Amino acid sequence: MKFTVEREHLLKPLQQVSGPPTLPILGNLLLQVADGTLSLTGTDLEMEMVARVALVQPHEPGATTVPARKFFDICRGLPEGAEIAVQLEGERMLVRSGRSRFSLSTLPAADFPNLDDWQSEVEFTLPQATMKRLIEATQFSMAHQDVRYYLNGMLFETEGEELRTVATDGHRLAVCSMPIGQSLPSHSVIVPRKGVIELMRMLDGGDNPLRVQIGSNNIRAHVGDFIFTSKLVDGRFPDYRRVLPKNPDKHLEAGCDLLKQAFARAAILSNEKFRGVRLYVSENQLKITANNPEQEEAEEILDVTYSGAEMEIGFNVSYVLDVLNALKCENVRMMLTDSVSSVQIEDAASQSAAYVVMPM
């Protein structure tokens, strides 16, 4: 196995396959030269990233595996415009560039683990920006290491011509739907949180569309010369329609950033553990208050657009702040029911995403 490639053609592929073990070979990248292509594979047994690099210079076929981080750190450490000559010699991989020479240990390619083979049941294409939008709008609401394993991940749902993401930790929910202009079956799967992070990581910028394949136990995303494959999560994800308030007809509208800074200041004097704040809504006005065990108190009063009846309601302020930070918009709509029911929150200008927060 031999190849010579430009540093700049190696960097991003290495970065993509490198991110991230007790089982050593999982710390290695599989390198394959075949049919004028270098393939770079990294895996953790649950998910897999494969990058393909075209070889325009002389090369020889073969396969090996090398320490991922070390190989990446060596390539990144080399100067702008460096040319990187690699060859398998003995049980070592030789890396040469200029007068820099490196000899890395290898583990046999035959030892590199493969995911189980599977069949694609559902397929579609969508813009990179759309997938980015879907993930960023909901990602923050996924659970972290909850015993309900199905919540430590993100639902991806196809319905009509819409792709939808749902994330919830049992206390708050985020949902976002986008048109992708294809007739899709009605289907949903849960992608593990690590898979979601990796999927987000591969976009990227630029105008490369994303190709998605969904199997009974796997998801695959093709973008450019990268292929990401993940296992799915078992379990019955909650139905976002049961979480959305059935009729939240008390509509409050306020500047997103003004609203956020008011909640953030009030948050300073909220209970450090429970983070509770009270909202007092009345005609065109919102009052936010907070207090802690040591009798410290915050009060914020804002002008808002509100014509409904007056009500009081308590919330975990971090949850509200999460939502407002996730809304990169000018105005927010808060949709209320009563003092003991959840609130729906949306961008005043768009219904594409919805956020639900339970009262305290």
For a second copy, the binding residues (CB under 8 A) are 70, 73-74, 77-79, 92, 99-105, 261-262, 264-265, 268-269, 294-302
Given 137, 210, 243, 262, the residue binding ligand 2VG (CB under 6 A): 243
238 contacts Ca ion (rule: CB under 5 A) = no
CB of 90 to Cl ion, least distance (A): 12
C-alpha torsion sign, points 96, 100, 105, 111 = negative
CA distance 149 to 152: 5
DSSP 31-76: EEEETTEEEEEEE-SSEEEEEEEE--S--B-EEEEEEHHHHHHHHH
Interatomic CA distance for residues 358 and 165, integer angstroms? 20
**Residue carrying the six token digits 């599977």:** 118
For residue 291, the partner it binds in Ca ion, Cl ion, ligand 2VG, none, with Cβ less than 5 to 8 A by kind, is Ca ion
Contact partner at residue 99 from Ca ion, a second copy, Cl ion, none, CB < 5 to 8 Å by partner kind: a second copy
Interacting residue with ligand 2VG among 21, 36, 113, 170 (CB under 6 A):
170
Taking the alpha carbons at both ends of the chain, their separation in whole angstroms is 62
Using the rule CB under 5 A, is 125 a contact of Cl ion?
no
Long-range contacts of residues 15-18, Cβ cutoff 8 Å, at least 24 apart: 15/72, 16/49, 16/51, 16/201, 16/202, 16/226, 17/41, 17/42, 17/49, 17/50, 17/51, 17/68, 18/42, 18/68, 18/69, 18/72
Residue nearest ligand 2VG by beta-carbon distance: 173
Chain positions 31 to 90 lying near ligand 2VG, rule: CB under 6 A, are none
150: DSSP letter: G
Does position 76 interact with Cl ion (CB under 5 A)? The reply is no
Considering the complex, state which of residue 43 and residue 152 has its C-beta at the smaller distance from ligand 2VG. Answer: 152
Contact partner, 294, from a second copy, Ca ion, ligand 2VG, none, Cβ < 5-8 Å per class:
a second copy
- Block residue for tokens 């136990």: 217
Q: Does 98 bind Cl ion (CB under 5 A)?
A: no
Q: Any bridge partners for residue 96, and if so which?
A: 85, 101
Q: Cβ closer to Ca ion: 166 or 323?
A: 166
148 touches ligand 2VG (CB under 6 A):
yes
- Say whether 214 sits in a helix, a strand or coil: strand
Q: Which positions ≥6 away from 146 have C-beta within 8 Å?
A: 152, 169, 170
178 touches, from ligand 2VG, Ca ion, a second copy, none (C-beta below 5 to 8 Å by class): none
At 264, give phi and psi (nearest 5°): -65, -40
> Does residue 318 belong to the site contacting ligand 2VG (CB under 6 A)?
no
Of 121, 297, 312, 330, the one binding Cl ion by CB under 5 A: 297
Q: Is the distance from CB of 239 to CB of 150 less than 8 angstroms?
A: no
Q: If contact means CB under 5 to 8 A according to the sort of partner, which of ligand 2VG, a second copy, Cl ion, none does residue 269 touch?
A: a second copy
Interface region with ligand 2VG, contact rule CB under 6 A, candidates 103-111, 169-177, 224-232, 260-268 = 169-177
Based on the shown chain and the rule CB under 6 A, indicate whether residue 360 belongs to the binding site for ligand 2VG.
Answer: no
Specify the amino acid at residue 246. K
Q: Does position 358 bind ligand 2VG by CB under 6 A?
A: yes
- Which residues contact ligand 2VG (rule: CB under 6 A)? 148, 151, 168, 170-173, 238, 243, 356, 358
- Which residues contact Cl ion (rule: CB under 5 A)? 101, 103, 297, 299
